[PDB]
């Protein structure tokens, strides 16, 4: 059971390089618009507390250099939507996929296409943490890289990368420029809140363990949502809702293990540990697989 | 994070190959489709297939090749070790710059898992020392390929053929020669005992020092032989002088001598992590190569 990213070719064909003055990052080129983080119009001097409304009025089309591989794109218009810059360009991308912009919830997963200088570098699978950060791998120049899901040739863009927090986790917006989490696009002191484990994803991962070989952690017992939720808080675990139980229903129906019975397994694992046994070859409990992820893979 | 390569250059080469009732994936490069030769097997042939006798009875029109909605015309065919090479009517217009390479255990690569010719997911892999892949491959995944990409040239190194009973996977290079002692035949065969890729753990430890963690270092050193005598008690691969030379650059960039990093690994194996993590893991990661670390 591997963590898998979506195939990235539909997105690779949209990545471009955006340069404003001395600042270069990545942009997303869909039809005749290029989307990128608005802090590209910041001068490094003004990363501390910029006024984006003012800095953009003073910009003109000629302040933006957009490069698609070998080819320079001519910017013919610019505007802002929340924290993303929208650069209208000369040419529609002939590789534009069927796509939509969506906003995801903490605990959902997506693929990230990490890019540098407009050129795709690698792909990995991520989860939006309960504290609204991403445990990604982003280096200098990675801003504007996007995250996405694919459903039957339709790309759902859900994330654009903006910044790294002092604990090495990452923060970004949806493609309409709304931040995930209580962060702002400026170099001021900010930090991730204390993170928590995504309970519904651990359970889904335990179902995947049962779907494969592993069954030793099953027991005769069952809990209640209220009794399990007291256990969850003690171990820094997101509380489990009736909504989570309902979505795990398919896996509970397929494997014959009710969710509150799996919770009994999980509560038991959280207290007594694994006693030298493993689950899908892992010694810790994995929480970056959603229920849909497990159904899809299996 | 362990990252796969962007998969688009390979997605444009995946096709569907059908022969009778068997369908799997093929790789379409220029005017040749490559795929596993057991596409020409039926039910009653998996146990003891005679591939020469099965192939002699086929003609070009027995092979149905589909690239998306378009049927390709097969105009020739031949067998090279355990891969079939289907000469087609049309050169793939999306053929990337590519080459074929055979890799060694410990090497990493990306896998594009496909079903019925359409890409489903991409993940990053290592060739294990027992010549198997710890992959994620379902019923129709055969013919999925593994690859690296360097300066826009795609190095194809793996094509998927079989699942072993332990859940791991075996396959061939793109010339059809199996990695390890496996055969494309449904008989009792089993992966040998697997071991940890020691040179990859050490390279990763060097990556931890470079990103500013040093908690696992100690003041000891070790001889190469003493290191290997301890490490093999944990099912770690022996470290060779070639591996030592290979880590040299990282040892220079960090100032930590290779054998001093070996002493730290012996201690990590002795103690565990005591609830800590090194890069982002509570496990010793062995699927990032020395070459990977510098990049
Ligand atoms: C880490 C740093 C101290 C530099 C800063 N962090 C914080 O200001 C915080 F602590 F508030 F998060 C930060 O990321 N930025 C400062 C400045 C932009 C952003 C930035 O340079 N983004 C990079 C875009 N290519 C990607 C970064 C590069 C390192 N790894 C990444 O992912 C803006 C928030 C406007
Ligand atoms: C797992 C099974 C017991 C069926 C068998 N294994 C062994 O015979 C062994 F144990 F000896 F390896 C096995 O894999 N095959 C039997 C037959 C082909 C191959 C096969 O069906 N390949 C699939 C290609 N689409 C991919 C497989 C599907 C399951 N998961 C995969 O990855 C050949 C070896 C000629």
In B, minimum Cα distance to A1 occurs at: B136
User: Max alpha carbon distance in chain B (Å)?
Assistant: 69
**Which method was used?**
X-ray
Torsion of CA B215, B220, B223, B226, to 10 degrees: -80
Residue nearest to atom 28 of ligand 2 (CA): B139
Q: Which sign, positive or negative, has the C-alpha torsion A233, A287, A99, A146?
A: positive
| Residue A132 contacts residue A103 (beta carbons within 8 Å) | no
Q: How much is the CA Rg of chain A, to the nearest whole Å?
A: 22
The tokens describing B188, both together, are 């009792």
Distance CA B208, CA B205 (A): 5
SS3 call for A288? coil
Q: How far is residue B121 from each of residues A6, A10, B11, B125, measured CA to CA in Å?
A: 5, 13, 10, 13
Whether ligand 2 lies within 6 angstroms of the CB of B37 is answered as: no
Distance B36 CA to ligand 2 centre (A): 12
* B152: CB partners within 8 A, 6+ apart: B9, B96, B97
- Answer whether B1 sits within 8 Å of A284, measured CB to CB: no
The tokens describing A272, both together, are 């007594």
| Residue B103 contacts residue B158 (beta carbons within 8 Å) | yes
Among A181, A287, A193, CA closest to A244: A287
Distance CA B48, CA B188 (A): 12
Distance CA A242, CA A73 (A): 50
User: Where do runs of H (alpha helix) occur along chain B?
Assistant: 8-11, 51-56, 198-210, 224-231, 241-254, 258-271, 290-294
Residues of B227-237 as b/e, b for ≥16 C-beta within 10 angstroms? bbebbeeeebb
The tokens describing A165, both together, are 């927090």
Resolution (A): 2.1
Distance CA A292, CA A294 (A): 5
Whether ligand 2 lies within 6 angstroms of the CB of B282 is answered as: no
Structural domain of A273 = 199-297
Give the closest of A12, A13, A283 to B283, CB-based. Answer: A283
Distance CA A178, CA B262 (A): 47
The secondary structure element, H or E, covering residue B74 is strand B74-80
B148 and chain A in contact, CB less than 8 A: no
Distance CA A100, CA A177 (A): 14
Beta pairing class for B153-163 and B98-100? parallel
What residues of chain B lie within 8 A of the CB of A8, using their CB? 6-8, 122
User: Where do runs of H (alpha helix) occur along chain A?
Assistant: 9-12, 52-57, 199-211, 225-234, 242-255, 259-272, 291-297
Q: Which sign, positive or negative, has the C-alpha torsion A103, A121, A69, A75?
A: positive
Q: Residue B277, CB half-sphere, CA atoms under 13 Å: how many?
A: 7
Ramachandran angles phi, psi of B33, nearest 5°:
-105, 125
Residue with tokens 């217009």: B93
Distance CA A81, CA B40 (A): 56
| Residue B56 contacts residue B79 (beta carbons within 8 Å) | no
| Residue B261 contacts residue B278 (beta carbons within 8 Å) | no
Residue B14, beta-bridge partner list: B27
Q: Which of B121, B151, B286 to mutate to test the interface with A (most CBs of A within 10 A)?
A: B121
Ligand closest to CA A42 = 1
What CATH number did the domain enclosing A226 receive?
Answer: 1.10.1840.10
Distance CA A69, CA A91 (A): 14
Identify the burial level of B17 via C-beta atoms within 10 angstroms of its C-beta, where 0-12 means exposed, 13-18 middle and 19 or more buried: buried
Distance CA B108, CA A274 (A): 30
């Amino acid at each position: 059971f591997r963590k898998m990213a979506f195939p990235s070719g539909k997105v690779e064909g949209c990545m471009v390089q955006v340069t404003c003055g001395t600042t270069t990052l990545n942009g997303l080129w869909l039809d005749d618009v290029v989307y990128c983080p608005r802090h590209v119009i910041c001068t490094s001097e003004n990363m501390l507390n910029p006024n984006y409304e003012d800095l953009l009025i003073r910009k003109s089309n000629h302040n933006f250099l957009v490069q698609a591989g070998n080819v320079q794109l001519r910017v013919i218009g610019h505007s802002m939507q929340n924290c993303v810059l929208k650069l209208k360009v000369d040419t529609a991308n002939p590789k534009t996929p069927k796509y939509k912009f969506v906003r995801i919830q903490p605990g959902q997963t997506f693929s990230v296409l990490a890019c540098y200088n407009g050129s795709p570098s690698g792909v990995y699978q991520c989860a939006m943490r309960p504290n609204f950060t991403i445990k990604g791998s982003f280096l200098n120049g990675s801003c504007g890289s996007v995250g996405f899901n694919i459903d039957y040739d339709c790309v759902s863009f859900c994330y654009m990368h903006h910044m790294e927090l002092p604990t090495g986790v990452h923060a970004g917006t949806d493609l309409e420029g709304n931040f995930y989490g209580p962060f702002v696009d400026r170099q001021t002191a900010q930090a991730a809140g204390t993170d928590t484990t995504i309970t519904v994803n651990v359970l889904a991962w335990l179902y995947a363990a049962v779907i494969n070989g592993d069954r030793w952690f099953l027991n005769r017992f069952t809990t209640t949502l209220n009794d399990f939720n007291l256990v969850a808080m003690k171990y820094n675990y997101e509380p489990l809702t009736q909504d989570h139980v309902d979505i795990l229903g398919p896996l509970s129906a397929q494997t014959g293990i009710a969710v509150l019975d799996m919770c009994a397994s999980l509560k038991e694992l959280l207290q007594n540990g694994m006693n030298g046994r493993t689950i899908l070859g892992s010694a810790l409990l994995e929480d970056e697989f959603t229920p849909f992820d497990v159904v899809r893979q299996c």
